[model samples]
Target: KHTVEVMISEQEVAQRIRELGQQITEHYQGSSDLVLVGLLRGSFVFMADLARQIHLTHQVDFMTASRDVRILKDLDDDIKGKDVLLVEDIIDTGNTLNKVKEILALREPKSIRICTLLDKPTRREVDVEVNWVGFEIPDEFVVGVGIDYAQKYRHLPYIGKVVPLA
Candidate 1:
């Protein structure tokens, strides 16, 4: 039987978010507003806390894009020439991230940076960079800690690899 490979745990996650929030807050201290764009589904949980933690005057928005997998549609308005940080749960295939970056590129944002809760690069099918990383986990099919299996166990509040049914 498979076992959990040292979960990040809810406590650790909460603490880490505060750290990330503090770091982001310092960087954007002078800005009147910054736009945080979340990638739907997975990022929803983390985005909420991060936005609250930033402590800066900022507007929140979301965008949904996918490659072979389907998700929500485009942003309500173009994010071009705006300061945006692309928040995501995990950078798995990298294809979706690249696609999202390309689509956003058309808008010409001041910058597009990634702040992911987890970065599992072993399964990367394409090369994508993450500007801010909360955790660098070993390459595995993690299901908890904001990641999921068939969209289940997303609320677990910690990272755990899923065991198979067989």
Candidate 2:
């Protein structure tokens, strides 16, 4: 898809973050016990900005569930007795998040929620309840702004489609 273009640019992304911040601030205003869990590698940067935007006092952690890793585990320390929010770049299958959620449930958190920057229903293996979302994109292989092709183009500030190989 050589005709592909930037779906969102750098400035627009900043604006989106601002909008997300305002919304999150409104949603989690009451307490400071919120815990934001970031999906490892891809969501690190986005999670950092989002955590800053949330108005209420909160802690942050990272966790992941991949096909390679059968067990869902936090990247850092433990998160117990906190209202947890899973922050991810995309919710495609929802399987990974579900696995992570099931694992966290065993840890005895007060509550659990999900927040993703992008949602691709086309790739969904299961219907997931995503609490906070940045965008809903059409089904396609995308790159840039954290999404990658063999670990490239991540430095780009916007989302784009790669040139299809013949």
* Lowest-sum lDDT 10-residue window in model 1: 65-74
Model 2 C-alpha lDDT versus the unseen true structure: 0.77
TM-score of each: 0.86, 0.87
lDDT of 2 at 122: 82
Alpha-carbon deviation at 74 in model 1, angstroms:
1.1
| Model 1 misplaced regions, further than 4 Å | 1-6, 67-72
Global Cα lDDT for candidate 1: 0.78
Q: Report the lDDT tens digits of candidate 1 across residue range 22-102.
A: 988888778764788888878988898778878888878887775264546777766767778888888877888877887
RMSD to the true structure for each prediction, in A, is 2.5, 2.3
Q: Which candidate's lDDT is highest?
A: 1
Q: Which residue ranges in model 2 land beyond 4 Å of their true spot?
A: 1-4, 67-69, 72-75
